[PDB]
UniProtKB/Swiss-Prot annotation, chains A, B:
Name assigned to this protein: Immunoglobulin kappa variable 4-1
Entire-sequence positions represented here: 21 to 121 of 121
SS bond list: 23-94
Keyword list, A-Z: Adaptive immunity, Cell membrane, Disulfide bond, Immunity, Immunoglobulin, Immunoglobulin domain, Membrane, Secreted, Signal
Residue ranges of the region described as Complementarity-determining-1: 24-40
Chain positions covered by the region annotation Complementarity-determining-2: 56-62
Length: 113, 113
């Protein structure tokens, strides 16, 4: 089964600065036929459900701020927040839906420094 | 935007008994062209990422105990946990992926009486 490992586990970034979170999959999640990477990114704040930010590794979800972007292919992916805002403090998770059982990374805590 | 509302918000159940969690969608998530309900259920414990339990409303993910079962259709769904065990203490979420933006219910916290 595919295992996702995120890094770092926690990130402290100054307000307005760029935040970068990585996710590495044990197996490629790139579908060679359609060229799609079955990888998604979620944001989750205390007492609230997860919120989808990016899917297909780099397509932005409806309603999600433009400062959120995803990149990468195969086994290495990255979530980038162009300009960190106070409201971006939360836990971020990557998820693969390439093959069952689907799985999530351990999560990365993002805080203001 | 399809909104999911779970009920109850929290519940306390006794070991060995049956727990029931409902999810209501503001609009139907049943695709009449293929007869599939684009609805999933997740389990999440403190400090851990979400874990997929059921998808397509009633298909149980591999590795998941058979005490977990999903039912329902259209706008009304139910997650049933039979023979409750201490390890089932967690927050449960329903998720719809019928139309964008995809969305999660507010979550239901399950505890042991």
């Amino acid at each position: 089964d595919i295992v996702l490992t995120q890094s770092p586990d926690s990130l402290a970034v100054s307000l307005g600065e760029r935040a970068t979170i990585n996710c590495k999959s044990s197996q490629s999640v790139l579908d060679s036929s359609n060229s799609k990477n079955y990888l998604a990114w979620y944001q989750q704040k205390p007492g609230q459900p997860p919120k989808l930010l990016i899917y297909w590794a780099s397509t932005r979800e409806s309603g999600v701020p433009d400062r959120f972007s995803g990149s990468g292919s195969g086994t290495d992916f990255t979530l980038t927040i162009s300009s960190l805002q106070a409201e971006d403090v939360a836990v971020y998770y990557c998820q693969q839906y390439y093959s069952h059982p689907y799985s999530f990374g351990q999560g990365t805590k993002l805080e203001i420094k």
